[PDB]
Design a protein around this ligand. Structure first.
Ligand code: 8DH
Length: 150
């Protein structure tokens, strides 16, 4: 019973989380997942400030109200070459990655690794945080509060 959470650098407290190496998070799961990192789904304003500090990914993820990809450099296979916070307009499907916002993180680029899941609750799942540099942190617990996400 294992969940892998790949996480990024934080930029003005905003970071990206990919679960089990594929688009697999619902909107309800995303809010609960960010809560386990003492975080919330970013507002569009929080995500735009993160973008301005150096944040970009090539993956769709939830923010408050939309599913987006922050882009700095145009890349044909990432948000169809767009720059800025690209907003997903048309999709048949409901599962993506998520972004999270932690107000206590540094104001600009923080590319240190994540070494905790501070607000997970008791549960049976081995949850592993995987950093981009491969370093890992694991803990037994649960973060999903909605049965349909389990
Ligand atoms: C921004 C996230 C990824 N964190 C660095 S953390 O979840 O590990 N954590 C550290 C302790 N207290 C917190 O609010 C957050």
């Amino acid at each position: 019973n294992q969940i892998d959470l790949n996480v990024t650098c934080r930029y003005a407290g905003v970071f990206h989380v990919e679960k089990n190496g594929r688009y697999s998070i619902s909107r309800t799961e995303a809010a609960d997942l960010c809560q386990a990192f003492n975080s919330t789904l970013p507002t569009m304003d929080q995500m735009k400030l993160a973008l301005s500090k150096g944040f970009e990914t090539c993956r769709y993820g939830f923010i408050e109200g939309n599913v987006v990809i922050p882009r700095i450099h145009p890349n044909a296979i990432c948000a169809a070459n767009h720059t800025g916070v690209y907003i997903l307009v048309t999709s048949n499907t409901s599962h993506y990655d998520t972004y999270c916002f932690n107000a206590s993180a540094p104001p600009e680029e923080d590319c240190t690794s994540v070494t905790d899941l501070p607000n997970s609750f008791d549960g049976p799942v081995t949850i592993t945080i995987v950093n981009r540099d491969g370093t890992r942190y694991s803990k037994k617990g649960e973060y999903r509060t909605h049965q349909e996400d389990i």
